[PDB]
Amino acid sequence: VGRLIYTAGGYFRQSLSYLEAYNPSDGTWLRLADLQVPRSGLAGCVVGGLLYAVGGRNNTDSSALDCYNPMTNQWSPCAPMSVPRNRIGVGVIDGHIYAVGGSHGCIHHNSVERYEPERDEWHLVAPMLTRRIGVGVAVLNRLLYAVGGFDGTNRLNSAECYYPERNEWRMITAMNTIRSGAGVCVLHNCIYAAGGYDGQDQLNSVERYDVETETWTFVAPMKHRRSALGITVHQGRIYVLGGYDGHTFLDSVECYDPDTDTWSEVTRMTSGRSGVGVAVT
Numbered sequence: 490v491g492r493l494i495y496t497a498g499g500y501f502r503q504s505l506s507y508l509e510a511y512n513p514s515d516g517t518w519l520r521l522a523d524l525q526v527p528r529s530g531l532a533g534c535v536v537g538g539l540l541y542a543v544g545g546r547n548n549t550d551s552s553a554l555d556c557y558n559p560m561t562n563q564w565s566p567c568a569p570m571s572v573p574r575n576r577i578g579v580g581v582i583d584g585h586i587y588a589v590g591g592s593h594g595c596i597h598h599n600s601v602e603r604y605e606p607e608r609d610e611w612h613l614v615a616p617m618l619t620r621r622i623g624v625g626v627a628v629l630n631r632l633l634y635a636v637g638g639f640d641g642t643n644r645l646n647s648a649e650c651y652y653p654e655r656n657e658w659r660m661i662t663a664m665n666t667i668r669s670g671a672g673v674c675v676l677h678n679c680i681y682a683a684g685g686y687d688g689q690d691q692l693n694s695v696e697r698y699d700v701e702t703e704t705w706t707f708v709a710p711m712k713h714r715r716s717a718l719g720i721t722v723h724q725g726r727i728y729v730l731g732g733y734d735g736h737t738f739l740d741s742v743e744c745y746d747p748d749t750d751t752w753s754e755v756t757r758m759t760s761g762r763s764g765v766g767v768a769v770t
């Protein structure tokens with residue numbers, strides 16, 4: 490009935506078609522219409538109550554944008570991006586979807602494009618300073634942040650900031666830890682970077698960046714270490730969904746209370762998966 494946490498796609502042995510929704514009010518899961526094409530490594534977002542699945546890898550790298558309407562339980566195709574973008578990052582500014590980075594085969598994108606729902610059109614914006622796949626994306630104060638990822642040579646702890654009015658990117662303070670495939674979100678005016686892969690291990694560490702003091706501080710780590718996790722914010726708490734811990738595909742969903750600096754496991758997906766697109770509406 491209320492706002493749900495949607496997880497689309499993912500990987501477990503193969504790319505998946507599942508669209509499921511979690512109700513944090515009563516702990517229930519709903520099963521919704523499958524995606525047209527199974528996809529992992531995509532990103533989710535919500536604009537005008539519509540859920541969007543962006544990019545990923547098919548079953549093969551995907552330029553697709555698909556739109557799910559919760560009121561009709563239907564997926565519809567949208568204008569494709571100018572390039573396939575697997576392991577994409579996505580952020581929304583003023584009802585516009587920014588597709589950041591990602592990979593096409595062995596090409597590691599630094600390009601960025603902007604989708605206009607009112608026109609069903611994508612347009613390129615200024616490219617990032619760094620090529621980033623597995624990049625975490627966060628929107629804060631009408632700025633778009635691109636955090637960590639892999640540039641094709643090094644895994645990254647750097648982060649950079651896009652200025653829509655200036656159409657430009659600037660590097661910001663780097664993270665304490667290198668992170669590709671982290672969950673990045675915004676909670677209570679800070680950017681959170683949860684988990685990821687530092688080049689040797691999946692991580693359970695979690696650091697937040699305070700823009701005022703422009704520094705990254707560690708906070709309480711998660712129970713299960715994980716990369717390629719889904720992440721979202723619901724009612725002032727962070728939810729991370731699934732992922733890969735180095736051996737298993739997680740079905741675990743942990744929830745972070747910023748006021749207690751605590752991670753509790755609050756439910757479990759119907760099956761373990763990583764590389765899901767996650768959004769709330």
Ligand SMILES: COc1ccc(S(=O)(=O)N(CC(N)=O)c2ccc(N(CC(N)=O)S(=O)(=O)c3ccc(NC(=O)CCN4CCOCC4)cc3)c3ccccc23)cc1
Pocket residue numbers: 499500501502503529530531545546575576622623638639669670671685686716717733735763764765
């Ligand atoms: C420890 O090694 C790692 C090194 C680095 C990383 S990463 O997080 O930093 N990273 C970015 C980067 N590499 O730069 C990523 C890798 C893979 C992704 N997936 C989708 C996609 N299109 O790539 S995925 O989640 O769905 C997945 C698919 C297969 C496998 N591995 C298997 O063996 C599958 C075979 N299984 C099948 C069932 O069981 C038996 C064996 C594990 C995960 C990512 C998705 C989003 C963001 C980042 C992703 C992660 C792990």
